[PDB]
Amino acid sequence: GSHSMRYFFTSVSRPGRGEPRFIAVGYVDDTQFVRFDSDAASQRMEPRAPWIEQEGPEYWDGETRKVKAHSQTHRVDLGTLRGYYNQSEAGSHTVQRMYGCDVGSDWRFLRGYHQYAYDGKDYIALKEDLRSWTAADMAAQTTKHKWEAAHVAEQLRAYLEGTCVEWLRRYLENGKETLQRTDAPKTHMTHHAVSDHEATLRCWALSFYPAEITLTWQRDGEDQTQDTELVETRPAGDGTFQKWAAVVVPSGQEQRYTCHVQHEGLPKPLTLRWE
Amino acid sequence: RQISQDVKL
Amino acid sequence: QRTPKIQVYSRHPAENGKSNFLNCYVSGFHPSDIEVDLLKNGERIEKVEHSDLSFSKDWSFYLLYYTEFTPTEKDEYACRVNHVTLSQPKIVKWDRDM
Ligand code: NA
């Protein structure tokens, strides 16, 4: 099974006073491990998972230095894009950036990412070949021209295929007690009468990790979809996740219906049946 | 571990 | 501008008189400025924390607001959300079955 390291950055201009609001977070898989908040008192990269705390002073100094430099660049970027897009200094705008790498089932490099949005829309993104750029518009095109001339993709490719994968693997080992523990969903079904004639079957998946999961309803062994409802996967707040899927059925016919649960923590898919 | 290169739009 | 999806729920299955955690998960929103309060019988709960801002593949933001609580038979809980996309604060009642 695969693993990822991701860094997410949000910069929001504050045209009334001062510098942009800047928030950075780093994830390994679905586990946040670092943060930087411009509005917090420390002004340092801070730990958010026990296993990154093993890292020494030089790591924290180096990660603080890099994230602060990055925040100043986003401040510049906000000014640059406001210029590109002919916008006034009066409104607030958002630059987002995400970068990172996956390792595959063979524990080697699988994919690299490095992409930006402006005011919630795609701006520029490194393609899967880690050699070319997708520029959404003519503003992003001028960024692309600059970056191609400066060999920005080569410098990113080296990080993504090297440092990124190497440190991801380091974290996965140092944090293995949780990072390489799969928490299979804790599943049950509940039953709610809607009328004398129909009832809701709700299939629960609780306390699972990682977040990726599939819940499917069947009737007489065939996928259903009609008269179903499926909430978006949500965080429990303890590092695990929750989801449910529901189906409305004729009362007395509950036994026909099965909930199917797929998750990395489950050797074989689970089947739940009210009966 | 963050990237070192300081890329600007 | 994208309006926030809202889910209100407990960390652990709700059992009256047993301590727990009340969650309000707001996602799919842009821009990121948002007001989120957890309420007990219409009144704002004061000791409410939230996760660090992050966003999904489509660039829309998500946050979890949460506080310790002890559910009872009578008490009502709710999540009140204001965002630029909303005419008035949207209130979502906690339903222990959801
Ligand atoms: Na301001």
Author numbering:
A (entry chain A): 1 to 275
B (entry chain C): 1 to 9
C (entry chain B): 2 to 99
Q: Can you provide the manuscript's text about this entry?
A:
Phosphopeptide antigens are naturally processed and presented on human tumour cells by class I and class II MHC molecules. We defined a canonical motif, involving a phosphorylation at position 4 and a positively charged side chain at position 1 (R/K), accounting for ˜ 50% of the HLA-A2 phosphopeptide repertoire. For phosphopeptides with this canonical motif (hereafter referred to as canonical phosphopeptides), the phosphate moiety could act as a “phosphate surface anchor”, mediating extensive contacts to HLA-A2. To address this, we determined HLA-A2 complex structures of three canonical phosphopeptide antigens (RQApSlSISV, termed PKD2 and derived from Protein Kinase D2; RQApSIELPSMAV, termed RQA_V and derived from Lymphocyte Specific Protein 1 (LSP-1); RQIpSQDVKL, termed RQI and derived from adenosine monophosphate deaminase 2 (AMPD2)) in both phosphorylated and non-phosphorylated states.
A third canonical phosphopeptide (RQI) was solved in phosphorylated (RQIp) and non-phosphorylated (RQInp) forms in complex with HLA-A2, to 1.7Å (HLA-A2-RQIp) and 2.1Å (HLA-A2-RQInp) respectively. RQIp exhibits a 75-fold enhanced binding to HLA-A2 relative to RQInp (Kd 25.5 nM versus 1925 nM, respectively). As with previous structures there was little difference observed in overall MHC structure (rmsd 0.62Å) for both complexes. However, unlike PKD2 and RQA_V epitopes, RQIp and RQInp peptides showed no conformational rearrangement (rmsd 0.39Å), although RQIp exhibited phosphate-mediated contacts (left) similar to those of other canonical phosphopeptides. As a result, the molecular surfaces of RQIp (left) and RQInp (right) accessible for recognition are very similar. Therefore the RQInp peptide closely mimics the main chain conformation of its phosphorylated counterpart, suggesting that, other than the phosphate moiety, the antigenic features exposed to the TCR would be very similar for RQIp and RQInp. Firstly, in HLA-A2-RQInp, residues E63 and K66 from the α1-helix interact with one another and form a cooperative stabilising hydrogen-bonding network with the peptide backbone amide and carbonyl groups of Q2 (left).
